[PDB]
Amino acid sequence: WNVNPVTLVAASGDTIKGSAVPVEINVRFSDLELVYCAPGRWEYVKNKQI
Amino acid sequence: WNVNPVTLVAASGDTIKGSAVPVEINVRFSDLELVYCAPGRWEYVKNKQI
């Protein structure tokens, strides 16, 4: 990540956050903690890495 | 930790960070989180005691 990054795709339905469009991560190091959150949501730890 | 300090060690092999010389964790609490990272690197969260 950076270089060729993530492409994060939630499929329709319950959003990860906001408008559900696929999120991308430039952040060089990164680690992704995401849970399905009862209001039909996928939590994402904001800006983080090692 | 604090008090009697830690010693993290990188000896030859791959560098933890930078020069691989042993990095010493002073701080009272600490959380040691490192990976073996394909650029031969062991990255640990700075600060992030418990």
PDB file of N, CA and C in Angstrom:
ATOM      1  N   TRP A   1       0.850  -1.169   0.000  1.00  0.00           N
ATOM      2  CA  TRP A   1       0.000   0.000   0.000  1.00  0.00           C
ATOM      3  C   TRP A   1       0.893   1.228   0.000  1.00  0.00           C
ATOM      4  N   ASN A   2       0.307   2.351  -0.394  1.00  0.00           N
ATOM      5  CA  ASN A   2       0.926   3.253  -1.356  1.00  0.00           C
ATOM      6  C   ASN A   2       1.115   2.431  -2.629  1.00  0.00           C
ATOM      7  N   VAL A   3       2.086   2.778  -3.488  1.00  0.00           N
ATOM      8  CA  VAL A   3       2.350   2.087  -4.755  1.00  0.00           C
ATOM      9  C   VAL A   3       1.006   1.590  -5.300  1.00  0.00           C
ATOM     10  N   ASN A   4       0.820   0.286  -5.416  1.00  0.00           N
ATOM     11  CA  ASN A   4      -0.504  -0.245  -5.702  1.00  0.00           C
ATOM     12  C   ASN A   4      -1.247  -0.496  -4.394  1.00  0.00           C
ATOM     13  N   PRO A   5      -2.315   0.218  -4.108  1.00  0.00           N
ATOM     14  CA  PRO A   5      -2.921   0.142  -2.783  1.00  0.00           C
ATOM     15  C   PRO A   5      -3.893  -1.012  -2.640  1.00  0.00           C
ATOM     16  N   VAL A   6      -4.646  -0.896  -1.540  1.00  0.00           N
ATOM     17  CA  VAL A   6      -5.922  -1.566  -1.363  1.00  0.00           C
ATOM     18  C   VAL A   6      -6.841  -1.197  -2.511  1.00  0.00           C
ATOM     19  N   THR A   7      -7.780  -2.093  -2.806  1.00  0.00           N
ATOM     20  CA  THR A   7      -9.129  -1.677  -3.175  1.00  0.00           C
ATOM     21  C   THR A   7     -10.118  -2.408  -2.293  1.00  0.00           C
ATOM     22  N   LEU A   8     -10.781  -1.663  -1.425  1.00  0.00           N
ATOM     23  CA  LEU A   8     -11.732  -2.229  -0.493  1.00  0.00           C
ATOM     24  C   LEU A   8     -13.122  -2.107  -1.072  1.00  0.00           C
ATOM     25  N   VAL A   9     -13.795  -3.235  -1.247  1.00  0.00           N
ATOM     26  CA  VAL A   9     -15.159  -3.220  -1.749  1.00  0.00           C
ATOM     27  C   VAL A   9     -16.057  -3.954  -0.769  1.00  0.00           C
ATOM     28  N   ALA A  10     -16.944  -3.208  -0.123  1.00  0.00           N
ATOM     29  CA  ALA A  10     -18.145  -3.760   0.474  1.00  0.00           C
ATOM     30  C   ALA A  10     -19.166  -3.915  -0.639  1.00  0.00           C
ATOM     31  N   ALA A  11     -19.946  -4.987  -0.593  1.00  0.00           N
ATOM     32  CA  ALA A  11     -20.932  -5.227  -1.638  1.00  0.00           C
ATOM     33  C   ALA A  11     -22.266  -4.649  -1.184  1.00  0.00           C
ATOM     34  N   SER A  12     -22.647  -3.517  -1.780  1.00  0.00           N
ATOM     35  CA  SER A  12     -23.943  -2.864  -1.605  1.00  0.00           C
ATOM     36  C   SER A  12     -24.363  -2.744  -0.145  1.00  0.00           C
ATOM     37  N   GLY A  13     -25.667  -2.886   0.101  1.00  0.00           N
ATOM     38  CA  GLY A  13     -26.201  -3.168   1.427  1.00  0.00           C
ATOM     39  C   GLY A  13     -25.651  -2.302   2.543  1.00  0.00           C
ATOM     40  N   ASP A  14     -25.351  -2.959   3.662  1.00  0.00           N
ATOM     41  CA  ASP A  14     -24.704  -2.332   4.803  1.00  0.00           C
ATOM     42  C   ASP A  14     -23.390  -1.692   4.385  1.00  0.00           C
ATOM     43  N   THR A  15     -23.261  -0.404   4.666  1.00  0.00           N
ATOM     44  CA  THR A  15     -22.052   0.321   4.331  1.00  0.00           C
ATOM     45  C   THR A  15     -20.959  -0.027   5.325  1.00  0.00           C
ATOM     46  N   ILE A  16     -19.709   0.089   4.886  1.00  0.00           N
ATOM     47  CA  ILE A  16     -18.625   0.179   5.854  1.00  0.00           C
ATOM     48  C   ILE A  16     -18.746   1.491   6.623  1.00  0.00           C
ATOM     49  N   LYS A  17     -18.732   2.604   5.895  1.00  0.00           N
ATOM     50  CA  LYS A  17     -18.923   3.948   6.408  1.00  0.00           C
ATOM     51  C   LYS A  17     -19.467   4.791   5.264  1.00  0.00           C
ATOM     52  N   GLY A  18     -20.301   5.773   5.597  1.00  0.00           N
ATOM     53  CA  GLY A  18     -20.739   6.743   4.611  1.00  0.00           C
ATOM     54  C   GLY A  18     -21.478   6.196   3.403  1.00  0.00           C
ATOM     55  N   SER A  19     -20.948   6.474   2.207  1.00  0.00           N
ATOM     56  CA  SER A  19     -21.666   6.225   0.960  1.00  0.00           C
ATOM     57  C   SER A  19     -21.352   4.872   0.324  1.00  0.00           C
ATOM     58  N   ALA A  20     -20.553   4.027   0.978  1.00  0.00           N
ATOM     59  CA  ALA A  20     -20.278   2.636   0.610  1.00  0.00           C
ATOM     60  C   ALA A  20     -19.419   2.476  -0.640  1.00  0.00           C
ATOM     61  N   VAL A  21     -19.062   3.557  -1.327  1.00  0.00           N
ATOM     62  CA  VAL A  21     -18.156   3.485  -2.471  1.00  0.00           C
ATOM     63  C   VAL A  21     -16.857   2.831  -2.013  1.00  0.00           C
ATOM     64  N   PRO A  22     -16.160   2.102  -2.882  1.00  0.00           N
ATOM     65  CA  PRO A  22     -14.976   1.352  -2.439  1.00  0.00           C
ATOM     66  C   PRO A  22     -13.860   2.256  -1.924  1.00  0.00           C
ATOM     67  N   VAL A  23     -13.380   1.968  -0.701  1.00  0.00           N
ATOM     68  CA  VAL A  23     -12.323   2.775  -0.094  1.00  0.00           C
ATOM     69  C   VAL A  23     -10.949   2.250  -0.499  1.00  0.00           C
ATOM     70  N   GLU A  24      -9.989   3.170  -0.575  1.00  0.00           N
ATOM     71  CA  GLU A  24      -8.624   2.884  -0.983  1.00  0.00           C
ATOM     72  C   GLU A  24      -7.686   3.432   0.081  1.00  0.00           C
ATOM     73  N   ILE A  25      -6.571   2.743   0.306  1.00  0.00           N
ATOM     74  CA  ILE A  25      -5.641   3.127   1.360  1.00  0.00           C
ATOM     75  C   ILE A  25      -4.264   3.350   0.750  1.00  0.00           C
ATOM     76  N   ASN A  26      -3.825   4.609   0.718  1.00  0.00           N
ATOM     77  CA  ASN A  26      -2.444   4.897   0.354  1.00  0.00           C
ATOM     78  C   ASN A  26      -1.499   4.513   1.478  1.00  0.00           C
ATOM     79  N   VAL A  27      -2.006   4.479   2.715  1.00  0.00           N
ATOM     80  CA  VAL A  27      -1.135   4.482   3.884  1.00  0.00           C
ATOM     81  C   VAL A  27      -0.173   3.316   3.781  1.00  0.00           C
ATOM     82  N   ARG A  28       1.122   3.628   3.819  1.00  0.00           N
ATOM     83  CA  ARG A  28       2.163   2.693   3.418  1.00  0.00           C
ATOM     84  C   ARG A  28       2.063   1.406   4.218  1.00  0.00           C
ATOM     85  N   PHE A  29       2.505   1.421   5.471  1.00  0.00           N
ATOM     86  CA  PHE A  29       2.084   0.385   6.393  1.00  0.00           C
ATOM     87  C   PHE A  29       0.605   0.577   6.641  1.00  0.00           C
ATOM     88  N   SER A  30      -0.107  -0.521   6.845  1.00  0.00           N
ATOM     89  CA  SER A  30      -1.463  -0.397   7.348  1.00  0.00           C
ATOM     90  C   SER A  30      -1.880  -1.729   7.932  1.00  0.00           C
ATOM     91  N   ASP A  31      -2.885  -1.667   8.790  1.00  0.00           N
ATOM     92  CA  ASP A  31      -3.545  -2.853   9.296  1.00  0.00           C
ATOM     93  C   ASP A  31      -5.018  -2.529   9.460  1.00  0.00           C
ATOM     94  N   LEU A  32      -5.859  -3.484   9.080  1.00  0.00           N
ATOM     95  CA  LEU A  32      -7.273  -3.186   8.944  1.00  0.00           C
ATOM     96  C   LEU A  32      -8.061  -4.048   9.911  1.00  0.00           C
ATOM     97  N   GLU A  33      -8.631  -3.402  10.924  1.00  0.00           N
ATOM     98  CA  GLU A  33      -9.542  -4.030  11.866  1.00  0.00           C
ATOM     99  C   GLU A  33     -10.944  -3.552  11.538  1.00  0.00           C
ATOM    100  N   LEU A  34     -11.792  -4.462  11.078  1.00  0.00           N
ATOM    101  CA  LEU A  34     -13.146  -4.083  10.730  1.00  0.00           C
ATOM    102  C   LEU A  34     -14.114  -5.169  11.169  1.00  0.00           C
ATOM    103  N   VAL A  35     -15.120  -4.762  11.931  1.00  0.00           N
ATOM    104  CA  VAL A  35     -16.135  -5.678  12.426  1.00  0.00           C
ATOM    105  C   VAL A  35     -17.451  -5.297  11.788  1.00  0.00           C
ATOM    106  N   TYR A  36     -18.343  -6.260  11.663  1.00  0.00           N
ATOM    107  CA  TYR A  36     -19.689  -5.927  11.244  1.00  0.00           C
ATOM    108  C   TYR A  36     -20.445  -5.412  12.466  1.00  0.00           C
ATOM    109  N   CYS A  37     -20.947  -4.181  12.376  1.00  0.00           N
ATOM    110  CA  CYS A  37     -21.438  -3.420  13.520  1.00  0.00           C
ATOM    111  C   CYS A  37     -22.952  -3.319  13.459  1.00  0.00           C
ATOM    112  N   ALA A  38     -23.608  -3.605  14.597  1.00  0.00           N
ATOM    113  CA  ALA A  38     -25.015  -4.014  14.580  1.00  0.00           C
ATOM    114  C   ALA A  38     -25.927  -3.074  13.809  1.00  0.00           C
ATOM    115  N   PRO A  39     -25.709  -1.765  13.782  1.00  0.00           N
ATOM    116  CA  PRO A  39     -26.495  -0.939  12.861  1.00  0.00           C
ATOM    117  C   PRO A  39     -26.046  -1.155  11.426  1.00  0.00           C
ATOM    118  N   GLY A  40     -25.937  -2.418  11.015  1.00  0.00           N
ATOM    119  CA  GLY A  40     -25.599  -2.757   9.651  1.00  0.00           C
ATOM    120  C   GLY A  40     -24.379  -2.023   9.149  1.00  0.00           C
ATOM    121  N   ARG A  41     -23.268  -2.145   9.861  1.00  0.00           N
ATOM    122  CA  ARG A  41     -22.120  -1.302   9.594  1.00  0.00           C
ATOM    123  C   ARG A  41     -20.852  -2.124   9.720  1.00  0.00           C
ATOM    124  N   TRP A  42     -19.822  -1.700   9.001  1.00  0.00           N
ATOM    125  CA  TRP A  42     -18.488  -2.268   9.129  1.00  0.00           C
ATOM    126  C   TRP A  42     -17.564  -1.178   9.665  1.00  0.00           C
ATOM    127  N   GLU A  43     -17.154  -1.318  10.925  1.00  0.00           N
ATOM    128  CA  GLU A  43     -16.221  -0.384  11.540  1.00  0.00           C
ATOM    129  C   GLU A  43     -14.901  -0.393  10.785  1.00  0.00           C
ATOM    130  N   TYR A  44     -14.235   0.755  10.733  1.00  0.00           N
ATOM    131  CA  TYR A  44     -12.886   0.830  10.185  1.00  0.00           C
ATOM    132  C   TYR A  44     -12.030   1.708  11.083  1.00  0.00           C
ATOM    133  N   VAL A  45     -10.925   1.149  11.576  1.00  0.00           N
ATOM    134  CA  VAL A  45      -9.989   1.923  12.377  1.00  0.00           C
ATOM    135  C   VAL A  45      -9.331   2.979  11.499  1.00  0.00           C
ATOM    136  N   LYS A  46      -9.441   4.242  11.915  1.00  0.00           N
ATOM    137  CA  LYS A  46      -9.349   5.377  11.001  1.00  0.00           C
ATOM    138  C   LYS A  46      -8.078   5.440  10.168  1.00  0.00           C
ATOM    139  N   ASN A  47      -6.995   5.845  10.787  1.00  0.00           N
ATOM    140  CA  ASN A  47      -5.708   5.999  10.126  1.00  0.00           C
ATOM    141  C   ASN A  47      -4.681   5.319  11.014  1.00  0.00           C
ATOM    142  N   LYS A  48      -4.133   4.204  10.544  1.00  0.00           N
ATOM    143  CA  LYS A  48      -3.362   3.367  11.446  1.00  0.00           C
ATOM    144  C   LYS A  48      -2.431   2.484  10.637  1.00  0.00           C
ATOM    145  N   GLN A  49      -1.367   2.047  11.297  1.00  0.00           N
ATOM    146  CA  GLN A  49      -0.368   1.176  10.709  1.00  0.00           C
ATOM    147  C   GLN A  49       0.555   0.722  11.829  1.00  0.00           C
ATOM    148  N   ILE A  50       1.588  -0.012  11.475  1.00  0.00           N
ATOM    149  CA  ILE A  50       2.626  -0.330  12.440  1.00  0.00           C
ATOM    150  C   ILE A  50       3.556   0.866  12.543  1.00  0.00           C
TER     151      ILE A  50
ATOM    152  N   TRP B   1       9.458  -2.453  33.021  1.00  0.00           N
ATOM    153  CA  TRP B   1       9.937  -1.476  32.074  1.00  0.00           C
ATOM    154  C   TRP B   1       9.779  -0.101  32.709  1.00  0.00           C
ATOM    155  N   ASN B   2      10.453   0.880  32.129  1.00  0.00           N
ATOM    156  CA  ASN B   2      11.134   1.940  32.881  1.00  0.00           C
ATOM    157  C   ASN B   2      12.150   1.212  33.749  1.00  0.00           C
ATOM    158  N   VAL B   3      12.477   1.770  34.920  1.00  0.00           N
ATOM    159  CA  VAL B   3      13.257   1.089  35.950  1.00  0.00           C
ATOM    160  C   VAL B   3      14.315   0.246  35.241  1.00  0.00           C
ATOM    161  N   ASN B   4      14.274  -1.061  35.413  1.00  0.00           N
ATOM    162  CA  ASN B   4      15.119  -1.935  34.624  1.00  0.00           C
ATOM    163  C   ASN B   4      14.662  -1.927  33.171  1.00  0.00           C
ATOM    164  N   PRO B   5      15.470  -1.422  32.255  1.00  0.00           N
ATOM    165  CA  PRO B   5      15.044  -1.299  30.865  1.00  0.00           C
ATOM    166  C   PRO B   5      15.087  -2.630  30.129  1.00  0.00           C
ATOM    167  N   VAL B   6      14.358  -2.645  29.049  1.00  0.00           N
ATOM    168  CA  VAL B   6      14.257  -3.754  28.112  1.00  0.00           C
ATOM    169  C   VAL B   6      15.502  -3.781  27.243  1.00  0.00           C
ATOM    170  N   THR B   7      15.719  -4.888  26.554  1.00  0.00           N
ATOM    171  CA  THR B   7      16.553  -4.867  25.363  1.00  0.00           C
ATOM    172  C   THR B   7      15.878  -5.669  24.268  1.00  0.00           C
ATOM    173  N   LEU B   8      15.481  -4.986  23.205  1.00  0.00           N
ATOM    174  CA  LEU B   8      15.133  -5.635  21.955  1.00  0.00           C
ATOM    175  C   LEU B   8      16.423  -5.815  21.192  1.00  0.00           C
ATOM    176  N   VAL B   9      16.550  -6.912  20.455  1.00  0.00           N
ATOM    177  CA  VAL B   9      17.815  -7.212  19.792  1.00  0.00           C
ATOM    178  C   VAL B   9      17.571  -7.555  18.333  1.00  0.00           C
ATOM    179  N   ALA B  10      18.308  -6.893  17.449  1.00  0.00           N
ATOM    180  CA  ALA B  10      18.509  -7.360  16.087  1.00  0.00           C
ATOM    181  C   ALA B  10      20.003  -7.536  15.861  1.00  0.00           C
ATOM    182  N   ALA B  11      20.424  -8.782  15.682  1.00  0.00           N
ATOM    183  CA  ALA B  11      21.828  -9.130  15.501  1.00  0.00           C
ATOM    184  C   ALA B  11      21.978  -9.769  14.130  1.00  0.00           C
ATOM    185  N   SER B  12      22.700  -9.095  13.241  1.00  0.00           N
ATOM    186  CA  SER B  12      22.865  -9.514  11.839  1.00  0.00           C
ATOM    187  C   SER B  12      21.467  -9.728  11.260  1.00  0.00           C
ATOM    188  N   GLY B  13      21.276 -10.753  10.431  1.00  0.00           N
ATOM    189  CA  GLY B  13      19.963 -11.046   9.903  1.00  0.00           C
ATOM    190  C   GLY B  13      19.360  -9.825   9.251  1.00  0.00           C
ATOM    191  N   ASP B  14      18.193  -9.420   9.742  1.00  0.00           N
ATOM    192  CA  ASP B  14      17.501  -8.233   9.265  1.00  0.00           C
ATOM    193  C   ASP B  14      17.442  -7.174  10.354  1.00  0.00           C
ATOM    194  N   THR B  15      17.375  -5.918   9.929  1.00  0.00           N
ATOM    195  CA  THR B  15      17.272  -4.812  10.863  1.00  0.00           C
ATOM    196  C   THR B  15      15.844  -4.701  11.358  1.00  0.00           C
ATOM    197  N   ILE B  16      15.680  -4.608  12.675  1.00  0.00           N
ATOM    198  CA  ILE B  16      14.383  -4.211  13.207  1.00  0.00           C
ATOM    199  C   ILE B  16      13.972  -2.874  12.606  1.00  0.00           C
ATOM    200  N   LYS B  17      14.714  -1.828  12.930  1.00  0.00           N
ATOM    201  CA  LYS B  17      14.541  -0.514  12.344  1.00  0.00           C
ATOM    202  C   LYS B  17      15.922   0.094  12.222  1.00  0.00           C
ATOM    203  N   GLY B  18      16.202   0.691  11.079  1.00  0.00           N
ATOM    204  CA  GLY B  18      17.470   1.373  10.938  1.00  0.00           C
ATOM    205  C   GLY B  18      18.625   0.408  11.094  1.00  0.00           C
ATOM    206  N   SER B  19      19.467   0.682  12.089  1.00  0.00           N
ATOM    207  CA  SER B  19      20.772   0.037  12.162  1.00  0.00           C
ATOM    208  C   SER B  19      20.714  -1.346  12.799  1.00  0.00           C
ATOM    209  N   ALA B  20      19.534  -1.806  13.212  1.00  0.00           N
ATOM    210  CA  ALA B  20      19.308  -3.097  13.861  1.00  0.00           C
ATOM    211  C   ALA B  20      19.934  -3.161  15.245  1.00  0.00           C
ATOM    212  N   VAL B  21      20.697  -2.154  15.665  1.00  0.00           N
ATOM    213  CA  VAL B  21      21.301  -2.214  17.000  1.00  0.00           C
ATOM    214  C   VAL B  21      20.194  -2.405  18.023  1.00  0.00           C
ATOM    215  N   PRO B  22      20.460  -3.012  19.174  1.00  0.00           N
ATOM    216  CA  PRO B  22      19.366  -3.309  20.097  1.00  0.00           C
ATOM    217  C   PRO B  22      18.649  -2.042  20.533  1.00  0.00           C
ATOM    218  N   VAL B  23      17.340  -2.026  20.332  1.00  0.00           N
ATOM    219  CA  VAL B  23      16.530  -0.911  20.797  1.00  0.00           C
ATOM    220  C   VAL B  23      16.021  -1.254  22.179  1.00  0.00           C
ATOM    221  N   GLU B  24      16.101  -0.267  23.047  1.00  0.00           N
ATOM    222  CA  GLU B  24      15.855  -0.441  24.459  1.00  0.00           C
ATOM    223  C   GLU B  24      14.564   0.272  24.791  1.00  0.00           C
ATOM    224  N   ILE B  25      13.609  -0.458  25.337  1.00  0.00           N
ATOM    225  CA  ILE B  25      12.348   0.141  25.732  1.00  0.00           C
ATOM    226  C   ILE B  25      12.505   0.574  27.173  1.00  0.00           C
ATOM    227  N   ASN B  26      12.586   1.880  27.377  1.00  0.00           N
ATOM    228  CA  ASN B  26      12.483   2.389  28.729  1.00  0.00           C
ATOM    229  C   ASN B  26      11.064   2.216  29.243  1.00  0.00           C
ATOM    230  N   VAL B  27      10.100   2.819  28.548  1.00  0.00           N
ATOM    231  CA  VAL B  27       8.847   3.323  29.112  1.00  0.00           C
ATOM    232  C   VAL B  27       8.156   2.304  30.011  1.00  0.00           C
ATOM    233  N   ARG B  28       7.566   2.783  31.114  1.00  0.00           N
ATOM    234  CA  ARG B  28       7.065   1.947  32.204  1.00  0.00           C
ATOM    235  C   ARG B  28       6.233   0.769  31.736  1.00  0.00           C
ATOM    236  N   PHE B  29       5.011   1.039  31.313  1.00  0.00           N
ATOM    237  CA  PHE B  29       4.317   0.063  30.504  1.00  0.00           C
ATOM    238  C   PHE B  29       4.886   0.132  29.099  1.00  0.00           C
ATOM    239  N   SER B  30       4.734  -0.961  28.357  1.00  0.00           N
ATOM    240  CA  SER B  30       4.876  -0.881  26.912  1.00  0.00           C
ATOM    241  C   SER B  30       4.183  -2.075  26.278  1.00  0.00           C
ATOM    242  N   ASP B  31       3.836  -1.892  25.006  1.00  0.00           N
ATOM    243  CA  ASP B  31       3.245  -2.933  24.174  1.00  0.00           C
ATOM    244  C   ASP B  31       4.199  -3.154  23.019  1.00  0.00           C
ATOM    245  N   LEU B  32       4.834  -4.313  22.970  1.00  0.00           N
ATOM    246  CA  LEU B  32       5.756  -4.575  21.883  1.00  0.00           C
ATOM    247  C   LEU B  32       5.026  -5.307  20.774  1.00  0.00           C
ATOM    248  N   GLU B  33       4.843  -4.616  19.655  1.00  0.00           N
ATOM    249  CA  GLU B  33       4.180  -5.166  18.484  1.00  0.00           C
ATOM    250  C   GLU B  33       5.105  -4.939  17.301  1.00  0.00           C
ATOM    251  N   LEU B  34       5.716  -6.006  16.803  1.00  0.00           N
ATOM    252  CA  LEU B  34       6.565  -5.892  15.632  1.00  0.00           C
ATOM    253  C   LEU B  34       6.275  -7.037  14.687  1.00  0.00           C
ATOM    254  N   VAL B  35       6.565  -6.806  13.419  1.00  0.00           N
ATOM    255  CA  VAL B  35       6.395  -7.821  12.399  1.00  0.00           C
ATOM    256  C   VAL B  35       7.747  -8.077  11.777  1.00  0.00           C
ATOM    257  N   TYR B  36       7.874  -9.219  11.137  1.00  0.00           N
ATOM    258  CA  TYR B  36       8.946  -9.408  10.181  1.00  0.00           C
ATOM    259  C   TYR B  36       8.384  -8.913   8.857  1.00  0.00           C
ATOM    260  N   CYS B  37       8.927  -7.800   8.365  1.00  0.00           N
ATOM    261  CA  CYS B  37       8.360  -7.056   7.242  1.00  0.00           C
ATOM    262  C   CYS B  37       9.232  -7.247   6.018  1.00  0.00           C
ATOM    263  N   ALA B  38       8.598  -7.583   4.887  1.00  0.00           N
ATOM    264  CA  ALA B  38       9.326  -8.062   3.707  1.00  0.00           C
ATOM    265  C   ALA B  38      10.513  -7.187   3.331  1.00  0.00           C
ATOM    266  N   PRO B  39      10.481  -5.901   3.490  1.00  0.00           N
ATOM    267  CA  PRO B  39      11.754  -5.165   3.457  1.00  0.00           C
ATOM    268  C   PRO B  39      12.590  -5.410   4.712  1.00  0.00           C
ATOM    269  N   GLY B  40      12.736  -6.690   5.078  1.00  0.00           N
ATOM    270  CA  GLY B  40      13.637  -7.136   6.126  1.00  0.00           C
ATOM    271  C   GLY B  40      13.582  -6.304   7.387  1.00  0.00           C
ATOM    272  N   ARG B  41      12.383  -5.922   7.803  1.00  0.00           N
ATOM    273  CA  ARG B  41      12.274  -4.887   8.813  1.00  0.00           C
ATOM    274  C   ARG B  41      11.337  -5.349   9.909  1.00  0.00           C
ATOM    275  N   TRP B  42      11.657  -4.976  11.137  1.00  0.00           N
ATOM    276  CA  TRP B  42      10.779  -5.241  12.264  1.00  0.00           C
ATOM    277  C   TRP B  42      10.289  -3.906  12.790  1.00  0.00           C
ATOM    278  N   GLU B  43       9.033  -3.611  12.511  1.00  0.00           N
ATOM    279  CA  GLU B  43       8.440  -2.331  12.836  1.00  0.00           C
ATOM    280  C   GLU B  43       7.621  -2.469  14.099  1.00  0.00           C
ATOM    281  N   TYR B  44       7.901  -1.616  15.072  1.00  0.00           N
ATOM    282  CA  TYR B  44       7.152  -1.639  16.312  1.00  0.00           C
ATOM    283  C   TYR B  44       6.492  -0.292  16.530  1.00  0.00           C
ATOM    284  N   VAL B  45       5.248  -0.337  17.005  1.00  0.00           N
ATOM    285  CA  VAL B  45       4.548   0.888  17.340  1.00  0.00           C
ATOM    286  C   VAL B  45       5.349   1.670  18.361  1.00  0.00           C
ATOM    287  N   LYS B  46       5.676   2.901  18.008  1.00  0.00           N
ATOM    288  CA  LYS B  46       6.366   3.764  18.942  1.00  0.00           C
ATOM    289  C   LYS B  46       5.372   4.294  19.957  1.00  0.00           C
ATOM    290  N   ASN B  47       5.851   4.481  21.180  1.00  0.00           N
ATOM    291  CA  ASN B  47       4.970   4.661  22.328  1.00  0.00           C
ATOM    292  C   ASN B  47       4.049   3.445  22.314  1.00  0.00           C
ATOM    293  N   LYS B  48       2.741   3.621  22.447  1.00  0.00           N
ATOM    294  CA  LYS B  48       1.806   2.522  22.599  1.00  0.00           C
ATOM    295  C   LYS B  48       2.266   1.569  23.702  1.00  0.00           C
ATOM    296  N   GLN B  49       2.473   2.118  24.894  1.00  0.00           N
ATOM    297  CA  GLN B  49       2.340   1.297  26.084  1.00  0.00           C
ATOM    298  C   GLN B  49       0.869   0.992  26.312  1.00  0.00           C
ATOM    299  N   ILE B  50       0.601  -0.032  27.123  1.00  0.00           N
ATOM    300  CA  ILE B  50      -0.765  -0.539  27.244  1.00  0.00           C
ATOM    301  C   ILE B  50      -1.697   0.617  27.531  1.00  0.00           C
TER     302      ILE B  50
END
